[PDB]
Ligand binder design. Structure first.
Ligand SMILES: NC(=O)c1ccc[n+]([C@@H]2O[C@H](COP(=O)([O-])OP(=O)(O)OC[C@H]3O[C@@H](n4cnc5c(N)ncnc54)[C@H](OP(=O)(O)O)[C@@H]3O)[C@@H](O)[C@H]2O)c1
Ligand SMILES: NC(=O)[C@H]1C[C@]2(NC(=O)NC2=O)c2cc(F)ccc2O1
Length: 316
């Protein structure tokens, strides 16, 4: 299968990337170095993950070592919710660039459609405990993102956790200069997202699937939540193809024409997770995995359910 998908900005994005949420700062430099050594060319980052400096140390080393050229890498980061104000977006991008040791990003995403009050706290909640919003409109945030393209700091802009109509708001924004290239959303067999994927693909927007393994290291997991890596039905499909459960869970979105970004800091698993271009799931396998949908989310942003722009009220 082809390793890179064409974006609506004319650049090609690797369909397999390395995730870095929850990767410890003491382990993520080695994790990104090993990932680049074994073939990965896309790294998914975010300022709110608090490890971009350490990701940058790895990228910089592999670039200086001439293990890879900058043009061959596809580096993604995300604008955090406390920087939606027009006057804060460039600084937020520039801090990410400085941390990552880069002079441009390949793709910069609005991390959530929800803007929060600016300040040192990433989740600034009022005496009572609810997120304090910003009044900045997300069409104005989008215009600020478009300026980053026109200034050369980013080659592509996109969105993340946007529901279908929020996508629609962006796409219908008066004066729209650049369409979003990507919508990065949670997607796996327990949250299959057919409606939202269809809408986005129909518009030339590429979808990236996050938490493709079900995020077993998510901070709020409970023993009684479903577990994709332990699902006997998924292990059965993996056994049939002589692959691991993780490899099936990574190959599944690839065959829906999605980009996928599994996280690991374990060198053996980083390597294993990339070995997904040598087998094919059947259509029957694909439909069977889709049938496991239960609308179950890893990331529901539970402190923001009353924000004007909370995304997960809408069906899709
Ligand atoms: N846009 C957003 O709002 C958003 C939200 C969530 C996630 N994301 C992105 O998506 C990435 C992936 O999602 P995620 O971090 O939630 O979870 P994930 O990729 O679904 O799962 C990560 C977990 O799976 C384990 N693991 C990886 N490979 C494995 C294998 N081959 N066998 C067994 N276990 C394996 C990892 O363990 P070890 O690391 O210990 O090996 C880790 O505990 C993130 O890191 C982030 O980059 C973005
Ligand atoms: N479940 C949620 O709603 C998650 C999302 C998230 N995970 C992720 O990758 N991007 C994100 O917003 C995350 C990351 C953080 F550093 C802090 C909070 C948090 O809430």
């Amino acid at each position: 299968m082809a390793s890179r998908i064409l974006l609506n900005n004319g650049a090609k994005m690797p369909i397999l990337g390395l995730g870095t949420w929850k990767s410890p700062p003491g382990q993520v430099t080695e994790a990104v170095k090993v990932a680049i050594d074994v073939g990965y060319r896309h790294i998914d980052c975010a300022h709110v993950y608090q490890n971009e400096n350490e990701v940058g140390v790895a990228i910089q080393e592999k670039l200086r070592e001439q293990v890879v050229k900058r043009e061959e890498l596809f580096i993604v980061s995300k604008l955090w919710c406390t920087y939606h104000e027009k006057g804060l977006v460039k600084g937020a991008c520039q801090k990410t660039l400085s941390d990552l040791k880069l002079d441009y990003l390949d793709l910069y995403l609005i991390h959530w459609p929800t803007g929060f009050k600016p300040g040192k706290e990433f989740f600034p909640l009022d005496e009572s405990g609810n997120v304090v919003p910003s009044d900045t409109n997300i069409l104005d945030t989008w215009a600020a993102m478009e300026e980053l393209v026109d200034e050369g700091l980013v080659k592509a802009i996109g969105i993340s956790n946007f529901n279908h109509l929020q996508v629609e708001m962006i796409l219908n924004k008066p004066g729209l200069k650049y369409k979003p290239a990507v919508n990065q959303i949670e997607c796996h067999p327990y949250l299959t997202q057919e409606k939202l994927i269809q809408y986005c693909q129909s518009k030339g927007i590429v979808v990236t699937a996050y938490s493709p393994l079900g995020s077993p290291d998510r901070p709020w997991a409970k023993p009684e939540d479903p577990s994709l890596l332990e699902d006997p039905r998924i292990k059965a499909i993996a056994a049939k193809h002589n692959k691991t459960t993780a490899q099936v869970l990574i190959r599944f979105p690839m065959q829906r024409n999605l980009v996928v970004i599994p996280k690991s800091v374990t060198p053996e698993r980083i390597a294993e997770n990339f070995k997904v271009f040598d087998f094919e799931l059947s259509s029957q396998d694909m439909t069977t995995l889709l049938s496991y949908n239960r609308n179950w989310r890893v990331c529901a942003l539970l402190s923001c359910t009353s924000h004007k722009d909370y995304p997960f009220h809408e069906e899709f």
